[PDB]
Design a protein around this motif. Structure first.
Motif, PDB file in Angstrom:
ATOM      1  N   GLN A   1      -0.286  -4.896   3.467  1.00  0.00           N
ATOM      2  CA  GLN A   1      -1.645  -4.438   3.723  1.00  0.00           C
ATOM      3  C   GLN A   1      -1.602  -3.271   4.695  1.00  0.00           C
ATOM      4  OE1 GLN A   1      -3.941  -7.233   6.086  1.00  0.00           O
ATOM      5  NE2 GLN A   1      -2.211  -8.655   6.128  1.00  0.00           N
TER       6      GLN A   1
ATOM      7  N   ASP B   1       0.831  -1.193   0.000  1.00  0.00           N
ATOM      8  CA  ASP B   1       0.000   0.000   0.000  1.00  0.00           C
ATOM      9  C   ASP B   1       0.871   1.250   0.000  1.00  0.00           C
ATOM     10  OD1 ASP B   1      -2.713   1.386   0.427  1.00  0.00           O
ATOM     11  OD2 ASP B   1      -1.551   2.124   2.131  1.00  0.00           O
TER      12      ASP B   1
ATOM     13  N   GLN C   1       2.507  -5.107   7.465  1.00  0.00           N
ATOM     14  CA  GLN C   1       1.148  -4.650   7.721  1.00  0.00           C
ATOM     15  C   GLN C   1       1.191  -3.482   8.693  1.00  0.00           C
ATOM     16  OE1 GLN C   1      -1.148  -7.444  10.084  1.00  0.00           O
ATOM     17  NE2 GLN C   1       0.582  -8.867  10.126  1.00  0.00           N
TER      18      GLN C   1
END
Lengths: 16, 16, 16, 16, 16, 16, 22, 22, 23, 22, 23, 23, 14, 14, 14
Positions: free
Chosen positions: F13, A12, E13
């Motif tokens: 993510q 991302d 993440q």
């Protein structure tokens, strides 16, 4: 102001 | 103001 | 103001 | 009968 | 009977 | 009987 | 000679990871 | 010779990952 | 079965394993 | 010779991933 | 079955495995 | 069945496996 | 025997 | 035997 | 035997 790569992958990225 | 890579991988990137 | 890499891996990156 | 060999690991989490 | 070999890992993440 | 070999991983993510 | 060798060279593997949370 | 070798060279593998959360 | 013979063979097994999280 | 070798070269594999959450 | 013979063979099994999350 | 013979062969099995999520 | 036999039974890790 | 036999029974990892 | 036999029974990973 962003960059992904080298060998292949992804994720991302958000700016401003 | 960001950068990922080298060998291949990815994650999260946020700026400003 | 950030950078990941060397050999391949990733994580989290936040600035400002 | 060999040459340069590489191996890698990694992980990561966090954020806000 | 060989040459350059590479291997990679990675993860990631986070965010907001 | 060989030459350059590459392998890659990756993930990612996050966002907002 | 009366025989043959087998499968010279090198070998490598990798392991796996995994994370996560609220 | 009276025999032959077999399958020279190199071999590699990889592992798997997985993440996630609310 | 008299007489010299061959040698053994390479055997490489396994890697790791990872888990874990908020439960 | 009275025999022959077989299937020289190299081999490669990969693993699998999976993610996701609310 | 007397006489010289051949050698063994390369054997290469497995990699990793990964799981995990919010339960 | 006397006499020289050949050798074994390369054997390469598996990779990884991954799962995971919010449940 | 006339040569060496090999056996391997790798259990399960975690 | 006249040569070496091999057996492998890799269990299940996690 | 007169040569070596191989057996492999790879279980299931996760």
């Amino acid at each position: 102001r962003g960059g992904l790569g080298g060998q292949g992958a992804g994720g991302d990225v958000i700016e401003v």
